From Swiss-Prot:
Phylogenetic placement of the source organism: Bacteria, Pseudomonadati, Thermodesulfobacteriota, Desulfovibrionia, Desulfovibrionales
Identification of the protein by name: Ferredoxin-1
Subunit structure of this chain's protein: Homodimer.
Free-text cofactor note: Binds 1 [4Fe-4S] cluster.
Domain of life: Bacteria
Domain 4Fe-4S ferredoxin-type: from-to ranges: 2-30
Role, per record: Ferredoxins are iron-sulfur proteins that transfer electrons in a wide variety of metabolic reactions.
Ligand binding ([4Fe-4S] cluster): C11, C14, C17, C54
Length: 64
């Protein structure tokens, strides 16, 4: 079991990840920034490539 999430707080003005995860990553009006709105929204291989993108990443996994 391996989960994850992101620090939309460090999210800039790009959607590179959202493109590699148009279901888990998605900016919000409350966070005015992309965030793992649903770890099941994207797959780990999509969440992976989406992790490579991003300037400082600001994304990480969530064991257990
Ligand atoms: S790739 Fe990084 S900077 Fe671009 S929206 Fe996703 S979280 Fe934000």
């Amino acid at each position: 079991a391996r989960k994850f999430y992101v620090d939309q707080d460090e999210c800039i003005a790009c959607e590179s990840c959202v493109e590699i995860a148009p279901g888990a990553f998605a900016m919000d009006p409350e966070i005015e920034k992309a965030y793992v709105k649903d770890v099941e929204g994207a797959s780990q291989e999509e969440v992976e490539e989406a992790m490579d993108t991003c300037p400082v990443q600001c994304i990480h996994w969530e064991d257990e």
